[PDB]
């Protein structure tokens, strides 16, 4: 189904920060030396973590796991929940809970893309830390400055909410 989260996520001018519509994304890291992060390229495609809006009566963790399973067939039982990062949000009215999880590196080998996902990409955390990070800043209506990030990885452009979550994960 269509999710408002995907609309706001593609809004080039929607600002994301951390500090009424609720959503969650799964931030799965492989259990290895140089951890890889599970990311998707939606059917240039929108780069995002598996995720979506919470259904009624559903928690952030349940949503994140369901979305990863619906999108790339990631079995929730393959995920060890590590807790969550701080919520990231945008003025318009979206609160996103990044749910952290750890999976075996092998788990990636058998994931299966569904129609809404074009490909699965797995940047290594080392790589994302080494890429020439783009740091811009915009000001909100209240006059508050806010940092914007963009990770130029292998020709792809990871930006917006996803990059904000990524940067927080890296810090
Ligand atoms: Mg969905």
Q: What is the DSSP string of 79-102?
A: -EEEEE---EEETTTEEEEEEEEE
Contact 24, 54 (CB under 8 A): yes
Range of the domain at 41: 1-171
In 3D, which of 73, 41, 69, 51 has the Cα closest to residue 5? 51
Q: What is the C-alpha to C-alpha distance for residues 141 and 52, in angstroms, rounded to an integer?
A: 27
Query: Is 71 annotated among the ligand-binding residues?
Result: yes
For 150, the token pair is: 């963009």
CA–centroid distance, 33 to ligand 1, in Å, is 31
* Span from the CA of 171 to the centroid of ligand 1 (angstroms): 28
Experimental method: X-ray
What's the number of domains the chain is made of?
Answer: 1
Q: What is the Å distance from ligand 1's center to 22 Cα?
A: 13
67 annotated among ligand-binding-site residues? yes
Of the candidates 85, 19, 49, the residue with the CA atom closest to the CA atom of residue 161 = 49
Q: Give the experimental resolution in Å.
A: 1.7
3-state SS, residue 55: coil
CATH of the domain at 33: 3.90.79.10
């Amino acid at each position: 189904p269509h999710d408002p989260l995907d609309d706001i996520q593609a809004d080039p001018w929607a600002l994301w920060l951390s500090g009424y519509r609720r959503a969650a994304v799964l931030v799965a890291l492989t259990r290895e030396a140089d951890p890889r992060v599970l990311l998707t390229v939606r059917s240039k495609g929108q780069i995002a973590f598996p995720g979506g809006s919470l259904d009624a009566g559903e928690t952030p963790t349940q949503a994140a796991l369901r979305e990863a399973q619906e999108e790339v067939a990631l079995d929730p039982a393959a995920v060890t929940l590590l807790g969550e990062l701080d919520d990231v949000f945008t003025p318009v009215g979206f609160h996103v809970t990044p749910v952290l999880g750890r999976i075996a590196p092998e788990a990636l080998d058998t994931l299966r893309v569904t129609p809404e996902v074009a490909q699965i990409i797995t940047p290594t955390l080392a790589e994302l830390r080494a890429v020439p990070l783009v740091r811009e800043r915009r000001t909100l209506p209240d006059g508050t400055e806010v940092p914007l990030y963009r990770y130029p990885w292998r020709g792809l452009d990871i930006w917006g909410m996803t990059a904000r979550v990524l940067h927080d994960l890296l810090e």
